[PDB]
Design a protein around this nucleic acid. Structure first.
Ligand SMILES: [Mg+2]
Ligand SMILES: [Mg+2]
Ligand SMILES: [Mg+2]
Ligand SMILES: [Mg+2]
Ligand SMILES: [Mg+2]
Ligand SMILES: [Mg+2]
Ligand SMILES: [Mg+2]
Ligand SMILES: [Mg+2]
Ligand SMILES: [Mg+2]
Ligand SMILES: [Mg+2]
Ligand SMILES: [Mg+2]
Ligand SMILES: [Mg+2]
Ligand SMILES: [Mg+2]
Ligand SMILES: [Mg+2]
Ligand SMILES: [Mg+2]
Ligand SMILES: [Mg+2]
Ligand SMILES: [Mg+2]
Ligand SMILES: [Mg+2]
Ligand SMILES: [Mg+2]
Ligand SMILES: [Mg+2]
Ligand SMILES: [Mg+2]
Ligand SMILES: [Mg+2]
Ligand SMILES: [Mg+2]
Ligand SMILES: [Mg+2]
Ligand SMILES: [Mg+2]
Lengths: 16, 244, 181, 170
RNA sequence: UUUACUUUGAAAAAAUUAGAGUGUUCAAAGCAGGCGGCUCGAAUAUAUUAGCAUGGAAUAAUAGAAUAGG
RNA sequence: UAUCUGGUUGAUCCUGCCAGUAGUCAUAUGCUUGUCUCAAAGAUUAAGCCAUGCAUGUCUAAGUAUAAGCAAUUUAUACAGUGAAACUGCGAAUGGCUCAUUAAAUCAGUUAUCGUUUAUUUGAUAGUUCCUUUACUACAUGGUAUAACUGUGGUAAUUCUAGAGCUAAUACAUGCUAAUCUCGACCCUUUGGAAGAGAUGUAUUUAUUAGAAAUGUCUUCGGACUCUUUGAUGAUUCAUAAUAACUUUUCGAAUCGCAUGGCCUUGUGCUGGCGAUGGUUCAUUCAAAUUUCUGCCCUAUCAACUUUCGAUGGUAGGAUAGUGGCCUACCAUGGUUUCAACGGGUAACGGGGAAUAAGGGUUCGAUUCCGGAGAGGGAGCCUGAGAAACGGCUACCACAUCCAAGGAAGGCAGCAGGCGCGCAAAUUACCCAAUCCUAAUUCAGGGAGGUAGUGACAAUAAAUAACGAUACAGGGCCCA
């Protein structure tokens, strides 16, 4: 039987 | 000493755990349980150093006592519980199921499985004997005593156990041509098929195994675990299929 | 207790240090490349001796043996990457032909001198130790830094340095303030 | 005081070993329990582990089995007649395994008449010497239990070649 | 024929040693995973003697109801 | 040794010789000591002696609170929040330190337990209906009982305790409550009903017993008709089962939290969920004890040793968890040795390892990991699954603290810090945040451990400057 298939991203903010 | 030891130095811990030598002075000492000390992975190591879900011992304790971790279909709260080979670990909150199988390197690998696969496990028949009241029973490699076995089930065979109820669904005989997995020695983690069981009276039996690449190697019988017939394993195998 | 942290010496005293030829050779090397003291020459001689002994031992082995192929390929790759060994020069026998000088040019101080950022090896060292030179995005203050071929052509003045774009140093602005006053 | 370790003894070659370590609890020994005929006195002993041992300081009664008919009856112990290890135990009437003792003939006899209706005939036939013992009123028995361990004086009756040899020794 | 002897395979903890990869700012070190299937990655080695299994024609011992008798 | 320098005469060459120049490591010591990373701390063969302080305690919803404890409330009607103290349970047998003793001993590798104990973890595992005083507690038995606590007291003094009064349990001691299964005549022909003949735990000890031409007929074409009937190991008196008795003889839940579902004949009736803690036996796991074979430095100016008081082996017994001269009684005369027994020395814990070496070799290895032994020196023990424990106890020897002289209290080869001299060397520092460990347990505890401080132990990198112009002068450098 086959194994289970494989399966939050970076976010950016600039201030000042 | 005068009694059982309760500490384990990091340098003395099993190598396959991959514990940093400089991180501390002591390593988790596996508590008593189904599997032997050297052939077991305590839950703390699995949750922290492998899955990286917890950052130190204390969040591991928090996770465990939240009852989010199930081993062998049962909730465990001991941080040093000795999970071992072919033990099913379920984290329902994450919807993740793992089966503990060594990689070709010989190290317990994070192998994700489906729920249907998680419903059953495999156990090598370590003993078959008549108990009290004349009730036959089988002892598997994980210390499970299953009563009223199928009388064909013999030592060195493997039995498929349903986790929910703990009965034998099916079994595989130890014969030439079956598919086996190495659970000890330098060949640890390799997968192959039997060619001969070489037998020595009063001595350790030796088994010759041929892999898919036709390479042949010899290992002691205690280190052999039947997992199916050739081309049809009863469990999902890790990446590489135990080659090299 | 905590597990030991291993260590090793990076240099060894030559066999008979006081040879006049050896003294003059160390003099020439130190003067040409601006080495602080003899320990640097001893260190690089130790490294080169280790490399060349390994090359000899591999050469002793027959052709096509697994260990010879694997170790020789690794050693040639490392020597080519660091820049001592040229691309057309990829054989262990030519590794036996290396000299300390090659590693000496591969020092960051020498590269800074040659690239024209500094006109002299000592000026180059002074620039390195004062945090004015950056390899890529990284400020390097170690003259013994070994420059790779790829890293060679990214050497520049650091953005924070007064020569690389930042504001003038303390001396310049102090003088400007006093002149204004 | 009593210890069993092989260390204090001389070596096979005759060399004498030096004291490797102090005495250990797990190689201990305890005083003998010289069981004697007298009112039942037994006291327990706390042994290694959670287990326990019984010390027969005194017993009169023991369970003796007539093998040839496959029965077992409780019977008073008359006295020690012969012991193969050391004869002072016979003199002092000390009860231990393999001691030869005398037991009452009463329950065995009554069972005999009850089952066989005789003081069928072929089955009732019994070896002559034991019939003489029945007529005497006391039977020779051999203790098969260890009164120093289990607190029992169970045994079995002598018969056949066993009986003949022990009578000859007597 | 048997042994000695020799080849090969298991076994000989970890740490240490040799070795592969990695811009800890360099280095002494530490370290095993990266991209969205990619045929990517410690590939690993190492131990005189004792025991176990195994292929051996020579060498050195050891054997014979050997070419015996009527 | 090499290389380098010098001496060997009236001088120069060529030889030959002599003196000095090699090396890391180790011990001691002198001077200097700015920055980053990292890391160690023995030594009088004195395992010699120690003031003071700390280093092992522990409570969840789930064993026991009328603390005359604290706070609460719909202002309390057995209790209910939180909770000192004490009982109870568990741990203290791990960890840390040191190398005194130890020369087939420890130890390394490799075997065996069909030779035995094993708390804990994990998986299984126990309806016995009935059996005269039913004159009957199971809608749940006692003090055959006490602490904490109230109160009266002794002693100079200690983690000293006497008498009296109280009260609990998962402490201690007792003790119960119309079942299941074989066949089954007769009806009925199945989803069948059942007149009745029968059978009924564990634990301990002994004895005995078991454990090894149906090639047909019919049939619906399927199927039915008769027979089988333990398993494992190389190997067993193995596993298991059975019969007869036996036992100062056990066990078979008189325990606790949360919650209030389902049936009705409407009764505080019957039934019922999720957990904790206990309990017999087996297996597994952590362990422990013995154990098979090979391997240790110097010594032969140690050649015979062991055996009277066990030395080798046989039988029986005692003892133990268990094998075994381990011990006892009786027996024989055995056992090792020039292939070095036995005795003596060892500044002898063994090993993984470290240094050197071209290779063979030689030396070191208290010291980060494993294993063994010890806690000033002998001897003996309670507890507990596990100790011959010493931050547990008792005696003796040597030391040594307090004293009212009547007595009491001792073990830093644990972390700091002292003495051992009249000559010297880390802080009586902070913390449980990391590592893991103990507990009733997320939470409390941990000089284990971590953080920082402190003689250049051993190692890595590396500052103390770089860039110009101007002026003046003719000698500077190498060989011989
Ligand atoms: Mg076996
Ligand atoms: Mg700056
Ligand atoms: Mg070998
Ligand atoms: Mg000084
Ligand atoms: Mg300065
Ligand atoms: Mg600074
Ligand atoms: Mg209250
Ligand atoms: Mg409460
Ligand atoms: Mg000696
Ligand atoms: Mg030996
Ligand atoms: Mg426990
Ligand atoms: Mg259990
Ligand atoms: Mg009272
Ligand atoms: Mg015996
Ligand atoms: Mg004797
Ligand atoms: Mg010594
Ligand atoms: Mg050592
Ligand atoms: Mg001790
Ligand atoms: Mg002392
Ligand atoms: Mg003691
Ligand atoms: Mg202690
Ligand atoms: Mg102390
Ligand atoms: Mg100290
Ligand atoms: Mg310290
Ligand atoms: Mg509880």
């Amino acid at each position: 039987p086959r194994a289970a298939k494989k399966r939050a991203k970076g976010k950016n903010l600039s201030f000042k | 000493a005068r009694g059982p030891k309760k500490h384990l130095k990091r340098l003395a811990a099993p190598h396959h755990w991959l514990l940093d030598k400089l991180s501390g002075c002591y390593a988790p000492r596996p508590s008593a349980g189904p599997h032997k000390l050297r052939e077991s992975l305590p839950l703390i190591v699995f949750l922290r150093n492998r899955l990286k879900y917890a950052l130190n011992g204390r969040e591991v304790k928090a996770i465990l006592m939240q009852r989010h971790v199930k081993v062998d279909g049962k909730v465990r709260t001991d941080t040093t519980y000795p999970a071992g080979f072919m033990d099913v670990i379920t984290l329902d909150a994450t919807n993740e199921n793992f089966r503990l199988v060594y990689d070709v390197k010989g190290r317990f690998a994070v192998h994700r499985i489906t729920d249907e696969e998680a419903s059953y496990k495999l156990g090598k028949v370590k003993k078959v004997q008549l108990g009290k009241k004349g009730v036959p029973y089988v002892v598997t490699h994980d210390g499970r005593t299953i009563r009223y076995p199928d009388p064909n089930i013999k030592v060195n065979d493997t039995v498929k156990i349903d986790l929910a109820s703990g009965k034998i669904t099916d079994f595989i005989k130890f014969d030439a041509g079956k598919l086996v997995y190495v659970t000890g020695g330098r060949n640890l983690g390799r997968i192959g098929t039997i060619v001969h069981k070489e037998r020595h009276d009063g001595g350790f039996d030796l088994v010759h195994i041929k892999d898919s690449l036709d390479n042949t190697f010899v290992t002691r019988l205690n280190n052999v675990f039947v997992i199916g017939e050739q081309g049809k394993p009863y469990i999902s195998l890790p990446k590489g299929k135990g080659i090299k | 207790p905590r597990a030991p942290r291993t260590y090793s010496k990076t240099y060894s005293t030559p066999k008979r240090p006081y040879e006049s030829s050896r003294l003059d050779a160390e003099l020439k090397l130190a003067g040409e490349f601006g080495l602080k003291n003899k320990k640097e020459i001893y260190r690089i001689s130790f490294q080169l001796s280790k490399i060349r002994r390994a090359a000899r031992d591999l050469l002793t082995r027959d052709e096509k043996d697994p260990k010879r192929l694997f170790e020789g390929n690794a050693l040639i790759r490392r020597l080519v990457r660091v820049g001592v060994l040229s691309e057309d020069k990829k054989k262990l026998d030519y590794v036996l032909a290396l000299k300390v000088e090659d590693f000496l040019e591969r020092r960051l101080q020498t590269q800074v001198y040659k690239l024209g950022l500094a006109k002299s090896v000592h000026h180059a060292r002074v620039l390195i130790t004062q945090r004015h030179i950056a390899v890529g995005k990284q400020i390097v203050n170690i003259p013994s830094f070994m420059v790779r071929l790829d890293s060679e052509k990214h050497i520049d003045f650091a953005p924070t340095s007064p020569f690389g774009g930042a504001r003038p140093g303390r001396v310049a602005r102090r003088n400007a303030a006093r002149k204004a006053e | 005081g009593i210890s069993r370790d092989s260390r204090h003894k001389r070596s096979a070659t005759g060399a004498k070993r030096a004291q490797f370590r102090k005495k250990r609890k797990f190689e201990l020994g305890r005083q003998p329990a010289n069981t004697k005929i007298g009112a039942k006195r037994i006291h327990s002993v706390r042994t290694r582990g959670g287990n326990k041992k019984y010390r027969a300081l005194r017993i009169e009664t023991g369970n003796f089995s007539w093998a040839s008919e496959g029965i077992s009856k409780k019977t008073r112990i008359a006295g020690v007649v012969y012991h193969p290890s050391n004869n002072e135990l016979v003199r002092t009437n000390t009860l231990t395994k393999a001691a030869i003792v005398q037991i009452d003939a009463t329950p065995f006899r009554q069972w005999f008449e009850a089952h066989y209706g005789q003081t069928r005939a072929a089955s009732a036939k019994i070896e002559s010497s034991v019939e003489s013992q029945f007529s005497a009123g006391r039977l020779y028995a051999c203790i098969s239990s260890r009164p120093g361990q289990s607190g029992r004086c169970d045994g079995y009756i002598l018969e056949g070649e066993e009986l003949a040899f022990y009578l000859r020794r007597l």
